[PDB]
Ligand binder design. Structure first.
Ligand SMILES: [Zn+2]
Ligand SMILES: [Zn+2]
Ligand SMILES: [Zn+2]
Ligand SMILES: [Zn+2]
Lengths: 16, 36, 394, 29, 320, 32, 348, 221, 108, 122, 268, 103
């Protein structure tokens, strides 16, 4: 339960 | 500034600030009567 | 090769194998010549050039540990290296841990680097936990050490910070001296203060060996799975119960493993008298140790305490066995000199009100409800046992 | 606790109420 | 000064205070030896039909004084606080006057007193070759003889560093060495006197010969063991470091208590005013002059009159 | 005063010592 | 009586040496000073008679302190464990006191050796870490070397080397002594080979041997198979047997007694080897003693650098805090900051 | 809050009594550089453990092992509280920091029975993660206490990958202002040094230095 | 790249245009990558380009004081000296107690 | 200084001043002076019977000790100047308890007469 | 602004903590203690810099004795004046904590006679005109809910034991040989307020303790710390408990600021 | 003299070094560009101080409570002599209106 401002795993996960 | 890392004007300013409490805080007013 | 086994009277069960950790093993006595070349090699110092090119953290530990106790404190006091306090705790001539705490506080008051005194004279909580656990391990060997630990805890409370780590170690200090009343009463104070019991001392309470200086050092390579199991069930028991239930479970295993079975039943005697809600694990554990001893070492108030705990939370067969064993031990010619179990007027209606509350929801309690009432009021006709065996066979 | 009253009859009621509490508390030997 | 530990080397103000006191050098220049130039001769201070007091002022660069009591009848001389930068005139003075050096009195064991004590016993002990010289001192000064080497490092006296003190040697009050049966010049010193702090007017004295008694008075505050010398027949008080001209001793050194120094100033109020007090530093005075025009004694009794229970008197700028 | 039942033998013997020395001293006046 | 501030009562003198007679005090006068009027409810009296003479011991601790007084200042032992440990803790303080005065000050002039030390402030290199010997000890050192240079130059770590240097340097300090009390003090700093330390492990071994036959007697009488040197395992077997039969709640896990038989056999072989060099009988050495002399030289080479390595560890912290702050500088890096140096995508 | 006065008995010297008893002497301590801005284990009080500090794995190396993992580079999460973890770092195995000192003493089989994955060999790379990098640093010293040759640390593991704002919540134990410390309550030392150790020159929020000896500088005047 | 040998007037212009909040925290950790000689020279050039020497640039800078106060803080740093849920249940249990004690009364 | 904080040679180290003689090399005295310096023959404990007395005997150095009121004040510092058989500390005593009457018949005997009394008799 | 703690030593002072610890493995009247501890703690080095005191905290101790029916040895050899039937003698020892060190301020011995003398014949034919007036204005305090920070070993044994021992002496002294002088004695023993401190100032107040003999001062410190059990462990605890409950009362003060300010805005 | 009195009112006070919570040194720079001196501050009446404290200085109720002991005493802003060349000692005597509040 958290909404972060920046994320580094998420743009690598979406294109995969 | 090489050996000691400070200058003599900067030495005198920090020397006056490391002991500011025990230099002068009160006027020591009042009168002391003899008790014996 | 055949060595005898100490009578723990513990249940041999796959559930309570974590409580079997802490028993001394005859397996470990057999692999002792396998470790004989390993201890001999470590007794020699390294070379001078390997010690000189050592890193700064390693060379500090390996010389101060070989230094005498007071000279090691002199290098700590002069260079203000407060993180070398676990190095001097394991010295070859270090005194009792009530002396080491005052020498710890003597080093930081004469230390060459002076912090603010709220940060300077504050020892880490792992050090106060290790200092009391050294003192509690010494209370196992000699119970008269508690009077000095009472004076030690009387100064650690007023100088250091009252943490749940230092309070849980003090419960283990009161437990190992044989004090059954005030150890559980200190644990009930932690439950009222919402303080969790320390799982590190809970694994050390159920291990009545392994002096905690050589546990953190790693001198015992085995029994670390047993150390991890007691920490995890202590994490398990705290999730649904309070801190007095976790500590009372540890005192039951400790008195079972020290062969002090007299004080083992004083824990259940004190837990019902104080108001501590016992966990479901230690209730079933108390039934099986009572089955191992066949009610030999038990009193009238201890069986009144177990039947009170089994009425609120317990199976019918465990409650039926402890009442069947208490009345049959009364019929034995050995226990005819000792008085019989007598239930007073108010507590007898209370355990019957709780067993009737369970009988309204459960079918196993409703058919055996009158058999519970027949066992506490002393009137036991054998035709109730005859119809019990007739309904079991048919 | 100390209660102040305005009459004699309520003090007679309370002292009768106080003795109802002292005999329902345990009858002496 | 002290041992350079880890926090003293990582402190910036330690590098800053050494810049303020000594400039760009940072190392304090020591207290050197007085050379053969700018040095005076031994003076005869007092001549009496009982004893003779011969002294020399400013014999060190600490501005200390060297005195000697010469007994007329026994021909026996006694040094008080034997610290001279040239103890060769004192050996020639006792050699040309047919005197026998038997003991050396020491008020206290600071570096202004025992810096040349091994030189005093060696040079004067070599002349009696063609019974050794004793040392009279108080065992409360044991903490200052351990730091005699530390004091020589700070004041630049490197030649007297590696010298074991003669009072540290095994005396009659110590257990003896068990030497191999297959050498007592340094193994045993039979002539050694340890003075007790319980000093009274009855029995705490040294029989100097021909009926003069040297009453030693325990008066700490400047040092742990500070033994004055009082000659009541001659009105002479060797105060040492306790009382000087218009000033008293320092308290800003270790093992120096200000409230012990005030009690030491109160125990000389029963002596007469014509008692010529002979200090270890500076000019000599009388005890009656210090009762009138000394502000340290004036502050000591003024705080006593207004009700101070722990009267603390003492200097922070002066003599060691 | 046996020490078994009376542990305050340091105080009770000290205070009766000071009752008599305040009585045997001759500086006090019994007359106001 | 009650005292007043500023008013004192003058009292007559007894005219017996003052309050403390400096000329001396007799036996019956000091008998009253011995049995001083202390309150006996908190006073412990003790005496011991040793043949001709006896010693009295009286100690009093007040009641107003035991909640705040130190455990070391008032060494009160309310248990038998604290009695045995508190006596051993106070024995080691006293024994270092009566031995420490034999080699430093208040010692014999031939028993005082000093060390010189010079450490570089920049390179952290130890220069001139020698001992300060006299001319008698230096005649022993060249007598050691000229024999060993005569034997190890025909065969075989360079020419100008000192063969077994830390062994002969440790033996030269012992050779130059003249008192046996200061001789054992130098044996204690050299790996603890003094006779009082060796006699304690001889008693600890002979009690383990006397306990090894106790476990051998129990196991043979119960059954009516064993390891090699059972007296090392005998404190571990006795701890389980006493735990099994019911007299004792705790069994032992401490394996420090493993290898103890050959250890104290090596410690007594190290001791007899070093006094063989003190008597200068090193012209003949068996193969057992020569393999002992090699391992003792490297063990004695690292015990004298205990003090110099602690000062070396502090000097590493001094040059660490003088480093440039931050992650570094751009001119003094071979690796990029955000990337590992062994990363495959290193060069973008 | 609201500026609670402290119960410690530190006091600056008066204006009447002389300065005495100089075998203990307080002075102000000021170091060369500030270290409050740095990481916790590269500060001044942790300077002796500088060689015990694990090597730093950065963010772009962590994204590389996310895409292309290696069979023996074991990413290990060292977060302790299960309530503060919300997402899963890829190719990671859970080893909490409170259990590291007992986990590495296990055998090869008992580590599998107590953690569900195989115990890593002493020669492979181990990379530890945490919230800020504090629990992974304390576990890295326990991983280096045992003979593990390659122990690595990602400082700011969870808070930079997932973008969270959390902490390991180290208490860093400081005495409460009712807890009176040792040297006021005790007769462990004599009364003159007891008064002089408790003396400080200035405010008591800054750091000080205690001198074990002092000599008077007679050469100034 | 050679981060210590970039032009100092170029760095203090690129750092002056940092106004977004998330890239401002990027600058805080990126400022440690410069050397100690470089980071004390970035303070003196940025103080003069906004002060007396503002005429050296072709266009004047914009006033970014939160970058100015952080660079002056970061240059002084490198230079030498010269559980919300569990806490909110604690306070609500105390106010529940104070109403039972009578310290928080009702309407009179 | 900081070097004299912890023992040996600390502030409250009461053994740093020196040790006793413990030798027959001086003051060869009689039975008369031992009796007037007995603990049991003193006035202040002759009329005291509430304190407990323990009479012990060394099996190695051969001394006869009596300690009273030890349960009230169990100081570990007592007997530290004992100096057992050959210049050892007082941890090498291994004392055994003796009664009141057999302490008196063993107190007047020399050190060797106590030792063969324990080994070959009783 | 205060907190009281009680302690009952059965069978005299020999059941204390110091008299019970011994070395192992080798009747009288009961004493009732009561320590009043207000929040009065200040630093006198600010008003006068010549005083080297960092902390000065005052707290009062009332020690009373009661004869049980179980003692047999010393029944009527001497009439005991400590009993509430005979005089009701009690010692009021005002203590102070001067830099974590217990110092006695005054040792008062008060009985029912001193309350009877102040109310009837303190003057020539009347009592004190101010002590009689302070007894004329004695309004009771509203019942405040007490909090129980007891010893953990006696936290769950019995709860109303200091309430039982408070009315044990209260029914014994009002029904005693001195009957109507107990309201004058309760205000004399009233440790909370200015009327009780003035009434105890009308009595003797004890001698100057530093003017006493040094053998008396060490024996009185051996009695209070050693025998009576009121030790420096308690004396350090009182200043800790004065600090903790000041923090506890500050949170209730912060709750009352919020409770008042929310009640104003909802009406305005 | 206005600089030093505002420094002592914000620093640590007493032998226990009690830190003053309100910083009165932030109001020094807004005091001197107005041209009002410490000697001119003593000549201000009660009506002129309320205009100065609310409008110009924006002094809070706790910062005005700490500055008022310096104004109610009329401390003279005279630099006293010291043993050093740089003196931080002001005469803390109470001023009189006959001598211009200079004591
Ligand atoms: Zn001097
Ligand atoms: Zn001098
Ligand atoms: Zn013996
Ligand atoms: Zn003025």
């Amino acid at each position: 339960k958290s909404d972060p401002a920046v994320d580094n795993v998420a743009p690598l996960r979406d294109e995969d | 500034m090489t050996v000691h890392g400070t200058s003599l004007p900067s030495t005198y300013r920090m020397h006056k600030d490391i002991n500011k409490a025990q230099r002068n805080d009160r006027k020591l007013s009042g009168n002391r009567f003899k008790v014996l | 090769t055949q060595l005898p086994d100490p009578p723990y009277y513990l249940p041999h069960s796959p559930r309570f194998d974590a409580e079997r950790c802490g028993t001394f093993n005859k397996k470990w006595l057999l692999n002792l010549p396998a470790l004989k070349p390993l201890v001999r090699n470590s007794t020699y110092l390294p070379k001078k050039e390997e010690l000189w090119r050592a890193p700064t953290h390693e060379a500090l530990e390996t010389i101060i540990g070989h230094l005498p106790y007071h000279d090691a404190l002199r290098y700590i006091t002069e260079h203000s290296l407060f993180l070398l306090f676990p190095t001097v705790l394991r010295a070859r001539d270090a005194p009792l841990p009530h002396v080491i705490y005052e020498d710890f506080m003597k080093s930081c008051t004469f230390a060459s680097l002076q912090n603010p005194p709220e940060e300077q004279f504050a020892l880490p909580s792992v050090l106060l936990r290790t200092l009391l656990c050294m003192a509690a391990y010494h209370c196992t060997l000699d119970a008269d050490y508690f009077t000095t630990c009472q004076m030690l805890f009387g100064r650690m409370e007023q100088q250091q910070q009252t943490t749940p780590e230092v309070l849980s170690a003090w419960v283990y200090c009161c437990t190992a001296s044989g004090r059954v009343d005030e150890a559980l009463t200190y644990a009930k104070y932690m439950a009222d203060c919402s303080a969790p019991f320390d799982v590190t001392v809970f694994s050390l309470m159920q291990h009545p060996s392994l002096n905690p200086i050589e546990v953190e050092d790693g001198s015992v390579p085995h029994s670390a799975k047993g150390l991890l199991l007691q920490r995890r069930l202590g994490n398990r028991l705290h999730t649904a119960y309070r801190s007095d239930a976790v500590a009372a479970h540890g005192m039951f295993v400790y008195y079972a493993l020290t062969l002090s079975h007299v004080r083992k039943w004083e824990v259940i005697r004190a837990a019902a008298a104080l108001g501590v809600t016992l966990a479901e694990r230690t209730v079933v554990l108390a039934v099986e140790v009572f089955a191992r001893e066949k009610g030999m070492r038990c009193g009238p108030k201890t069986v009144k305490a177990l039947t009170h705990f089994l009425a609120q939370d317990g199976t019918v067969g465990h409650l039926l066995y402890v009442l069947l064993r208490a009345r049959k031990n009364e019929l034995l010619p050995e226990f005819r000199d000792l008085p019989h179990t007598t239930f007073s007027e108010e507590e007898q209606e209370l355990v019957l009100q709780c067993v009737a509350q369970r009988a309204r929801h459960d079918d196993s309690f409703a058919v055996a409800a009158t058999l519970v009432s027949s066992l506490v009021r002393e009137d036991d006709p054998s035709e109730l046992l005859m119809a019990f065996a007739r309904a079991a066979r048919n | 606790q100390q209660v102040v009253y305005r009459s004699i009859r309520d003090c007679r009621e309370r002292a009768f109420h106080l003795i109802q509490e002292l005999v329902s508390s345990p009858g002496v030997a | 000064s002290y041992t350079p530990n880890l926090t003293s080397l990582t402190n910036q103000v330690n590098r800053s205070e050494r810049l303020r006191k000594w400039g760009s050098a940072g190392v304090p220049p020591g207290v050197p030896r007085i050379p053969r130039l700018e040095a005076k001769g031994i003076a005869i201070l007092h001549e009496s039909p009982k004893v003779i007091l011969a002294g020399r002022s400013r014999c060190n660069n600490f501005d200390s004084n060297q005195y000697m009591l010469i007994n007329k009848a026994t021909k026996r001389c006694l040094l008080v606080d034997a610290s001279d930068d040239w103890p060769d005139d004192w050996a020639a003075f006792i050699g040309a006057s047919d005197l026998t050096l038997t003991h050396v009195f020491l008020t206290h064991c600071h570096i202004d007193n025992i810096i040349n004590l091994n030189a005093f016993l060696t040079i004067c002990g070599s002349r009696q070759k063609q019974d050794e010289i004793g040392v009279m001192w108080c065992p409360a000064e044991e903490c200052w003889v351990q730091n005699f080497k530390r004091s020589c490092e700070r004041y630049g006296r490197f030649e007297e560093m590696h010298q074991v003190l003669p009072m540290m040697c095994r005396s009659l009050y110590t257990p003896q060495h068990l030497v191999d049966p297959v050498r007592n010049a340094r193994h045993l010193r039979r002539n050694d006197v340890l003075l007790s702090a319980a000093t009274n007017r009855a029995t705490s004295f040294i029989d100097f010969g021909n009926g003069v008694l040297l009453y030693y008075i325990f008066s700490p505050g400047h040092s742990p063991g500070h033994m004055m010398l009082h000659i009541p027949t001659e009105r002479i008080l060797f105060s040492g470091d306790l009382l000087f001209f218009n000033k008293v001793g320092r308290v800003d050194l270790p093992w120096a208590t200000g409230v012990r120094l005030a009690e030491s100033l109160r125990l000389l109020e029963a002596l007469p005013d014509n008692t010529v007090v002979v200090p270890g530093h500076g000019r000599m005075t009388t005890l009656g002059r210090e009762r009138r025009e000394n502000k340290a004694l004036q502050q000591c009794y003024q705080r006593q009159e207004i009700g101070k229970q722990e009267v603390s008197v003492g200097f922070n700028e002066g003599y060691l | 005063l046996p020490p078994s039942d009376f542990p305050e033998n340091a105080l009770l013997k000290c205070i009766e010592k000071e009752i008599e020395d305040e009585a045997l001293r001759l500086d006090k006046e019994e007359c106001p | 009586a009650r005292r007043k501030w500023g008013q004192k009562t003058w009292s007559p003198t007894a005219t017996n040496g003052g309050a403390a007679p400096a000329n001396g005090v007799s036996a019956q006068e000091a008998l009253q000073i011995a049995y001083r009027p202390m309150p006996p409810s908190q006073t412990v009296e003790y005496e011991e008679d040793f043949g001709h003479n006896l010693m009295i011991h009286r100690e009093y601790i007040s009641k107003r302190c035991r909640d705040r007084v130190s455990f070391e200042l008032s060494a009160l032992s309310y248990s038998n464990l604290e009695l045995r440990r508190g006596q051993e803790h106070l024995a080691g303080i006293m024994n270092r006191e009566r031995r420490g005065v034999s080699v430093g000050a208040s010692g014999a002039p031939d028993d005082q050796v000093q060390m010189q030390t010079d450490v570089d402030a920049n390179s952290r290199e130890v220069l001139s870490a020698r001992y300060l010997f006299n001319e008698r000890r230096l005649q022993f050192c060249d007598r050691f070397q000229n024999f060993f240079q005569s034997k190890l130059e025909n065969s075989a770590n360079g020419h100008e080397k000192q063969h077994l240097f830390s062994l002969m340097e440790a033996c030269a300090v012992i050779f130059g002594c003249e008192t046996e009390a200061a001789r054992e003090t130098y044996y204690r700093m050299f790996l603890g080979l003094d006779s009082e330390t060796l006699l304690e492990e001889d008693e600890a071994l002979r009690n383990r041997i006397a306990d090894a036959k106790l476990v051998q007697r129990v196991l043979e009488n119960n059954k009516g198979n064993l390891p090699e040197e059972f007296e090392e395992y005998a404190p571990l077997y006795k701890a389980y047997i006493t735990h099994a039969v019911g007299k004792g709640p705790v069994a032992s896990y401490d394996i420090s007694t493993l290898g103890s038989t050959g250890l104290t056999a090596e410690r007594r072989r190290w001791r007899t080897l070093m006094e063989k060099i003190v008597r200068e009988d090193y012209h003949t050495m068996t193969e057992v003693e020569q393999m002992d002399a090699i391992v003792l030289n490297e063990q004695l080479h690292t015990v004298k650098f205990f003090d110099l390595k602690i000062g070396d560890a502090i000097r590493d912290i001094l040059q660490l805090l003088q480093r440039e702050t931050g992650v570094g500088s751009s001119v003094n890096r071979d690796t990029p900051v955000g990337i590992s140096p062994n990363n495959p995508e290193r060069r973008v | 809050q609201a500026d609670r006065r402290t119960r410690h008995h530190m006091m600056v010297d008066g204006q009447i009594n002389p300065r005495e008893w100089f075998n203990w002497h307080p002075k102000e301590y000021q170091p060369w550089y500030f270290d409050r801005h740095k990481f916790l284990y590269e500060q001044r009080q942790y300077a002796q453990f500088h060689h015990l500090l694990c090597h730093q794995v950065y963010l772009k190396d962590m994204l590389h092992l996310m895409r292309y993992p290696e069979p023996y580079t074991h990413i290990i999460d060292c977060r302790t509280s299960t309530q503060k973890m919300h997402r899963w770092v890829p190719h990671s195995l859970w080893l909490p920091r409170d259990e590291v000192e007992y986990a590495l003493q296990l055998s090869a089989d008992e580590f599998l029975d107590m953690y569900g994955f195989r115990k890593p060999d002493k020669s492979d790379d181990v990379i530890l993660l945490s919230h800020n990098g504090i629990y992974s640093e304390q576990a890295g010293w326990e991983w280096k206490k045992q003979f593990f040759q390659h122990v690595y640390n990602y400082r700011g593991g969870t808070n930079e990958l997932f973008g969270e704002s959390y902490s390991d919540m180290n208490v860093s134990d400081v005495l409460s202002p009712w807890k009176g410390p040792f040297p006021q309550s005790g007769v462990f030392v004599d009364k003159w040094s007891k008064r002089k150790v408790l003396t400080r020159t200035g405010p008591f929020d800054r750091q000080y230095e205690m001198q074990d000896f002092a000599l008077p500088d007679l050469e100034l005047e | 790249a050679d981060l210590d040998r970039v032009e100092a007037r170029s760095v203090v212009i690129a750092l002056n245009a940092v106004t977004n909040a998330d890239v401002y925290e990027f600058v805080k950790k990126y400022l440690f990558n410069f050397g100690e000689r470089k980071v004390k020279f970035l303070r003196t050039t940025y103080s003069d380009l906004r002060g007396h020497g503002a005429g050296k640039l072709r266009i004047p800078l914009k006033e970014n004081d939160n970058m100015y106060y952080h660079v002056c803080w970061h240059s002084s740093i490198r230079s030498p000296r010269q559980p919300n849920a569990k806490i909110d249940d604690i306070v609500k249990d105390k106010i529940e107690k104070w109403k039972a004690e009578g310290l928080l009364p009702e309407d009179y | 200084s900081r070097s004299t904080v912890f023992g040996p040679g600390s502030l409250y180290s009461f053994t740093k001043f020196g040790s006793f003689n413990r030798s027959p090399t001086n003051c060869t005295l009689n039975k008369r002076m031992k009796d007037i310096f007995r603990l049991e023959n003193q006035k202040h404990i002759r009329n005291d019977f509430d304190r407990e007395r323990r009479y012990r005997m060394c099996t190695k150095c051969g001394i006869t000790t009596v300690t009273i009121n030890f349960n009230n004040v169990p100081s570990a510092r007592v007997g530290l100047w004992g100096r057992c058989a050959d210049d050892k500390d007082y941890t090498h005593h291994r004392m055994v308890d003796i009664t009141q009457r057999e302490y008196e018949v063993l107190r007047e005997s020399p050190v060797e007469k106590r030792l063969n009394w324990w080994r070959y008799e009783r | 602004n205060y907190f009281v703690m009680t302690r009952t030593l059965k069978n005299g002072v020999q059941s204390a903590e110091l008299n019970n610890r011994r070395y192992r493995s080798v009747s009288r009247a009961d004493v009732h203690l009561t320590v009043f501890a207000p929040f009065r703690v200040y630093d006198p080095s600010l008003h006068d810099p010549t005083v080297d005191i960092c902390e000065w905290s005052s707290f009062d101790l009332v020690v009373q004795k009661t004869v049980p029916d179980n003692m047999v040895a010393n029944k009527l050899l001497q009439p005991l004046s400590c009993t509430p039937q005979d005089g009701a003698l009690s010692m009021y020892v005002c203590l102070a904590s001067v830099n974590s060190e217990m110092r006695i301020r005054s040792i008062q011995l008060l009985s029912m006679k001193e309350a009877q003398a102040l109310v009837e014949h303190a003057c020539f034919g009347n009592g004190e005109p101010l002590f009689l007036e302070l007894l004329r204005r004695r309004g009771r305090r509203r019942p405040l809910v007490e909090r129980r920070f007891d010893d953990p070993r006696l936290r769950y044994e019995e709860v109303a034991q200091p309430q039982q021992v408070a009315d044990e002496a209260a029914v014994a002294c009002s029904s005693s040989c001195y009957g109507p002088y107990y309201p004058a004695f309760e205000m004399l023993m009233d440790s909370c307020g200015s009327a009780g401190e003035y009434s105890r100032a009308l009595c003797y107040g004890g001698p100057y303790v530093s003017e006493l003999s040094r053998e008396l001062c060490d024996a009185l410190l051996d009695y209070i710390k050693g025998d009576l059990g009121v030790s420096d462990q308690l004396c350090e605890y009182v200043c800790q408990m004065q600090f903790f409950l000041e923090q506890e009362e500050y949170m209730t003060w912060l709750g009352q600021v919020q409770h008042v300010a929310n009640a104003v805005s909802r009406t305005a | 003299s206005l600089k030093l009195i505002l420094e002592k009112l914000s620093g640590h006070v007493g032998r226990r070094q009690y830190k003053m919570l309100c910083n009165l040194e932030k109001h020094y720079d807004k005091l001197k560009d107005e041209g009002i001196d410490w000697h001119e501050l003593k000549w201000l009446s009660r009506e002129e101080l309320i205009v100065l404290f609310d409008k110009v200085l924006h002094l809070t109720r706790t910062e005005r409570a700490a500055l008022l002991p310096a104004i109610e005493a009329k401390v003279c802003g005279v630099l006293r002599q010291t043993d050093s060349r740089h003196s931080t000692v002001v005469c803390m005597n109470r001023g009189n209106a006959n001598h211009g509040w200079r004591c």
